[PDB]
C-alpha cells in the first residue's frame with residue numbers, strides 16, 4: 001500500500017489545442033516563493049521538469065494564504081478550463097443545489113490538497129505546462145507540467161468526484177439536512193444549525209476529510225440574509241426642480257427593469273422651464289406615485305429569471321468613500337442580484353475584495369462565476385490584483401472605461 | 411564535435427507523415443559543391459548516407475552566401491517545418507542592460523557550429539532525408555539524413571537553447587557567483603573576479619563546454635572590451651546605445667524622417683529629454699516614401715534640441731539591488747512625457763518618454779497616472795520591483811481627482827517634486843445647482859438623411875435661441891448646444907442636457923480632445939467661475955427640455 005491509483009482518460013475539446021498563454025512578469029519575491037514551492041512539489045512527485053517539445057503554457061502567480069502567513073502558488077487555468085469545458089461540465093458536471101443559498105450559515109472549506117493524491121492521465125499532462133519566469137529575461141524560465149490533478153483546473157473536481165462522494169457519504173447519512181456543494185477546490189457547507197453547533201459540525205466534517213489527505217481544511221456566509229432592496233428614492237426628494245429632475249432620471253432608468261414604475265405625475269410639476277434651485281407648488285398625485293414606485297423597488301424584479309445555459313455578468317461601480325455597488329445579470333439590465341460592498345484604504349484592494357465577495361455569492365446562488373466588467377485600467381488591474389487576491393479561483397474579466405450615470409442610479 | 415547530451419524527442423503533427431518533395435536538377439557546379447560539403451559533414455558524423463528505402467526527401471541546394479566563394483549548403487525545410495510539432499517559446503524577451511549589476515569583467519564566447527554540435531532525436535532523423543541529384547537527375551542521387559540539428563529546421567532554435575541550459579547548469583552550480591547569459595550562439599560571462607582569476611574561470615568554462623562537445627574556437631576567450639549587442643554597447647560598469655549619426659541634409663525624404671525618428675526613439679532610453687512629436691507630425695498621411703517633406707519650424711526646433719542632447723556621449727549605470735529605484739517624470743510638451751530612473755541622484759540607469767493616446771478626450775492627471783503605470787510594469791520586468799516615484803503633481807490635486815473620479819486606481823509610493831509645468835485641473839464642475847445662475851435647457855437634433863441640424867436653448871429667464879447647423883449629427887448637435895449655452899451665459903451657469911454622451915465627456919474634466927468642438931467647450935469651461943451640468947431623459951415632457959426639444963426639432967427631424 002504505497003504506489004499509484006488508476007487514471008481517468010481526459011480529452012481536450014474536439015479540434016482544440018492546449019493553451020499557450022504568456023507568463024506575466026513577476027516581482028522578485030514572488031519568483032523566489034514559486035521556485036521554493038516548485039522545488040518542494042517536484043521533490044514530492046506532483047510536477048516534473050519538461051523540455052522544449054512541450055509548447056503549452058498557463059500563467060502562474062504567487063499569493064498569500066492570509067496576511068503575510070505563507071505563500072501559495074496560483075495557476076491561472078482559465079484558458080485550459082475553457083478548452084476542457086465545452087465538453088466537461090457535461091461529461092462530468094457536478095449539479096448545483098438550490099437549497100444552499102437558503103441556509104443560515106455556509107462555510108467554505110478548501111479541499112484542493114486532496115487532488116494531489118490522484119495521478120493525472122499521462123497524455124493530458126503536457127497541457128498543464130507552466131513557467132516560472134526570470135527577472136529581466138536573464139535566464140530562459142523554469143518549466144514544469146503536472147503529474148497529479150492540479151488545483152485550479154475544472155477537471156480536478158470532476159475527476160475526484162467519485163472519491164469525494166465516498167468520503168462524504170457517512171457524514172451526509174449522519175446529517176441528512178446539511179447541504180454540501182463542491183466548486184473547484186472548495187466545499188461549501190450549509191446548515192440551519194445555531195452558529196456554535198454549525199462550527200462543531202464543520203470540525204466533524206474536517207475529521208472525515210483528514211483521513212483522506214486533507215490537513216485541517218478551510219469562514220462563514222449567511223446567505224439567507226442576502227438582500228434585495230437596492231434602488232433607493234430620497235425622502236427630501238420632492239423639494240427642488242433639480243431634485244425632482246434627478247428623481248425622474250432614477251425612475252426612468254428603473255422602469256427599464258421593473259414593470260409598473262410611473263413618473264407621469266412627477267413630470268407635471270416640472271411643468272414650465274424653471275430655475276434648477278426652485279422649490280415646488282405641487283406634491284399630491286405625485287406623492288402617491290412616488291410611494292407606489294417605492295413599494296415596487298422593494299420587491300424582486302417580476303419577469304427576470306436565471307438561464308443556466310447563459311453566462312453571468314457582473315458590473316461594479318465605484319461610489320466613493322470606500323463604497324462599491326454591483327449588479328449581476330445575463331442580459332443587460334435584467335438584474336438577477338444587486339448589492340453593495342463597503343469598507344469604511346486603496347481602490348484596487350477594495351475592488352479585488354468586491355470581486356471575490358461577488359464571485360463567492362455567485363457560486364453559492366448559481367454554481368457559476370460571473371464575467372466582470374471592471375472599472376479600472378487593464379494594466380493597473382494586471383499589476384496589482386495578486387497583491388490582494390486570496391481565492392483559489394479566478395473569474396473572467398474585462399475592463400470598462402465608460403460609466404454612464406449608472407453610478408448615480410445605484 | 412557532437413554533444414553527448416540526451417536528445418529531445420520530437421514528433422510530426424497529428425495525422426501528418428513526413429515530407430516527400432522531389433529534388434530539382436541543379437547545375438554541375440552546385441552538385442560538385444554539395445558533394446564536397448556533404449563528404450566533410452559525413453566524416454564529422456553530422457550526416458549519414460541512407461538507402462532509397464527511406465521515402466521522404468526535402469530539396470537541397472548550394473550558393474555563395476555571406477560572399478561564400480567556398481560555397482554553402484542550403485536546405486529548404488519549408489515542408490518538414492509545416493509538418494513538425496510546435497516547440498516551447500522560441501524566445502520571447504531580451505534583458506535590458508539597465509537591469510544588470512556592475513561586474514569587473516565580462517567576456518563573450520561564440521560557440522562554433524552551434525546547431526551541428528547538438529544531436530537530433532533519431533526516431534526523427536529519417537524525416538530530414540535529402541538528395542544530391544545526379545547530373546540531369548539521370549541517375550539515382552546520393553542520399554543522406556541529419557544526425558544533428560539542421561540549419562533551417564523549426565526545432566533547432568529551442569532544442570539548441572534547451573541543450574545549452576542543461577549543459578550550463580552543472581557549471582553554474584559549482585560557480586554560483588558567475589553570471590551567464592545565452593543569446594543564440596553566444597555566451598556572455600560576467601564575474602567580480604580579478605583579471606587573472608576571471609581568465610582562469612573562463613578557461614574552466616571553455617573546458618567544461620568542451621566536455622559537452624561545444625567548442626569556442628575563439629581561443630584565449632576572444633571578443634574585444636566594448637561588446638555590441640542588440641543595438642547596445644556594453645562595458646562591465648556602464649552601457650549605452652551604439653551610435654546615432656543624425657544626417658546633415660537640406661532635403662529629408664519620408665524614408666529619412668522614419669529612420670531618424672526610429673534612431674531618436676532608440677536613443678531616448680538613455681538620452682533624457684529626446685523629442686519626436688514634431689518630426690512625427692511631418693509623417694501625417696504618408697506622401698509615398700521618396701517624397702521630400704520640408705521641415706516645419708516646430709520640426710526644426712525639435713531636431714536642433716535633439717542634436718544638442720546627442721552632443722556628448724551619455725552612459726547608463728547598472729543596478730544595485732541594495733538600493734531603491736527612483737523614477738521621476740516631467741511633462742515635456744503637449745501629448746508628451748519624459749522620465750528618468752536612477753538610484754543615486756542623477757546617475758540614470760535609464761530614461762524614456764511616454765506620449766499617451768488613451769481616448770479621444772483626456773486630462774493631464776489621467777495621462778500622468780498612465781505614464782506611472784507604464785513605468786511600474788517596466789520596472790517589474792527589468793528589476794523585479796517597483797520604484798518610488800517623484801511626480802510634478804501636488805498630493806492634493808491627485809487625491810481630489812482620484813477620490814472623485816469613477817475609475818479605480820493605485821500607484822506605488824510617490825512624492826511631489828516642483829519641476830514645472832505642474833499637472834493641475836484647469837476647471838471643476840459644481841456639485842450642486844448654482845443659486846442665482848441662469849439655467850439653460852439645451853438640446854440638439856439632426857435629421858440623419860440631410861445631416862441638417864439645429865442647436866439651441868431656452869432659459870428660466872425666457873431667453874431663447876436656435877442656430878441652424880449643416881453637415882452634423884445628433885452627437886455633434888448636443889455638443890454645439892452646450893457650447894452655445896456657454897458662449898451666451900455669464901460667469902455662473904446651470905446647463906440641463908439630455909445627452910449622456912456630452913455629460914459623459916464633460917464630467918471627466920478633459921483638458922484636451924481630438925474633437926475641436928470639445929476643445930472649444932473646454933476653453934469656455936476654463937473662463938467660467940462656476941458651471942453645474944445636469945442630465946434629464948429625452949421626451950419625458952420635462953419642463954424646459956420639453957420646450958427646447960420642440961424648437962430644435964421643428965426644423966431638424
Ligand SMILES: Cc1ccnc(SC(F)(F)c2nc3ccccc3o2)n1
Pocket residue numbers: 505510511512513516517589590591598599600639644645646647728
Ligand atoms: C555586460 C554586463 C554588465 C554587467 N553584468 C553583466 S552579466 C553578463 F555578462 F552575463 C551579461 N552579458 C549580457 C549581455 C546581454 C544581456 C545580458 C547580459 O548579461 N554583463
Ligand SMILES: [Ca+2]
Pocket residue numbers: 852853854855888908909
Ligand atoms: Ca438632445
